[PDB]
Amino acid sequence: DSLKVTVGTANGKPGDTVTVPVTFADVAKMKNVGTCNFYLGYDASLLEVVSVDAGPIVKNAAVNFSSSASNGTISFLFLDNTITDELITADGVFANIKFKLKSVTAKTTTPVTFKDGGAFGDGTMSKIASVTKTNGSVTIDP
């Protein structure tokens, strides 16, 4: 029925670096993923992104996976540059985002959200029309 793309969660204390996963599910059901781009929002007064790394489901990430983070937006772009041979075919972690936690006076949960934009292409690079996006978060506990 739909591709599930879910931002997970993490927690720590100010100064901690935490990892927030971005997970795909029902991949085969949707005929695999050949390409995708999407955009996540985060509160830049509470989180700073340290790094964004491809997860286990992305083959040949050095060639096929890119990301960028600036002032509260993280961008992701994946393409199987072989077109047929390095597709996303498995459910699992597409990306891992590392955030460094900034200071708070009281325990706070802050969202990591999908922003409007981008598209997902299946194993033939055709639009996947139904994509169920789930927002995640980080909990900062002083």
């Binding site: 390409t35 955009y39 890119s66 598209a119």
Partner: protein, 56 residues
Amino acid sequence: IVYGDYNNDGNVDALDFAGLKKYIMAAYVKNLDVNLDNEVNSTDLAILKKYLLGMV
């Protein structure tokens, strides 16, 4: 008349990126020549890549 809009759907997104990659691996398509140099090649793909990563 929308640069980058490979499949003409009113959005410039990964579907277009994939379509452009396939195209270059295979003529002249005006809206794929995003640097207006009268060629569609890997430079246009690279420009679209950077655009998508800077878009929002």
